């Protein structure tokens with residue numbers, strides 16, 4: 088389920104009330120996160136669980152949850168690069184309902200997108216390194232894209 | 234090892250006859266007059282070799298006759314188009330002995346990139362060739378290298394000194410191929426300059 092802030096604490100535990108707040112009632116067993124817990128590490132743990140519990144049937148969950156896991160691992164260690172949060176948002180958009188074979192992957196990307204929506208300063212703090220995907224090959228001048 | 238035309242034969246070479254043959258070959262290889270014949274872009278590189286930056290005149294090969302009777306060398310510098318092939322054959326037939334042929338460029342060698350309905354696939358389909366130059370176009374110094382190769386081939390061929398006395402057959406040297414000669418120094422190459430510099 089999507090993370091909610093302290094402002095949403097004054098809301099009745101109904102399906103329609105939590106549905107209009109941008110989350111789900113779910114099993115109605117709420118979990119509280121304090122100020123000590125880093126949101127990036129918590130979302131990394133959640134996505135690690137969700138990626139290793141994929142059944143492997145369909146491409147977006149099976150091949151995109153490990154990408155989000157690796158991005159969150161890099162953000163945890165301060166090895167984040169530009170475009171990582173954009174990749175996480177694209178994964179949120181493209182792992183929604185109707186795009187995967189079952190509802191496991193929309194539930195996987197709900198906490199990631201809610202924590203990005205509410206705690207974006209913690210995810211942006213992990214991006215330190217410049218984006219690098221290639222190494223230099225001697226004798227070939229790279230296409231310097233601007 | 235020689236090739237006879239009138240057969241894979243041996244060296245026919247008195248010591249005065251050998252000296253006379255050497256003098257005739259020296260005079261022939263040091264005075265080679267090409268025929269001014271323009272077929273395609275390879276001719277542009279050939280006449281570039283004739284200019285001041287390369288100066289093919291240093292080898293005594295600049296006179297560039299417009300008449301086939303006065304020319305000793307025919308350079309097929311360009312594509313052998315099917316409409317131009319009888320012209321090439323007629324101009325070659327109007328040349329007088331001794332005469333030599335250099336195919337310049339991929340078109341004259343084999344047809345090159347023009348395996349097409351209107352192109353003869355190489356000039357050696359219909360006229361005999363002495364030196365082949367790969368390239369499209371070969372650079373002017375490649376043409377000068379072929380000129381030196383032709384000079385080496387001329388320098389140890391055997392032709393009659395007079396048409397009234399002696400053997401009238403033409404003996405052409407069976408040279409070692411340049412590929413097998415240069416294989417030792419070419420395979421030993423390890424490192425080249427990287428293509429990112431000038």
Ligand SMILES: CCCCCCCCCCC1=C(C)C(=O)C(OC)=C(OC)C1=O
Nearest residue numbers: 269280283284290294295296297298299
């Ligand atoms: C053997 C005695 C030669 C005397 C001079 C011959 C005429 C001048 C040099 C040849 C020549 C001619 C005819 C010529 O027309 C020409 O222009 C295409 C040249 O430059 C590439 C030449 O080098």
Ligand code: SF4
Nearest residue numbers: 142143144145148189
């Ligand atoms: S979304 Fe569902 S069907 Fe697709 S691989 Fe994940 S667990 Fe399997």
Ligand code: SF4
Nearest residue numbers: 274338339340369370
């Ligand atoms: S070999 Fe290449 S450069 Fe020479 S005549 Fe043909 S197309 Fe032109």
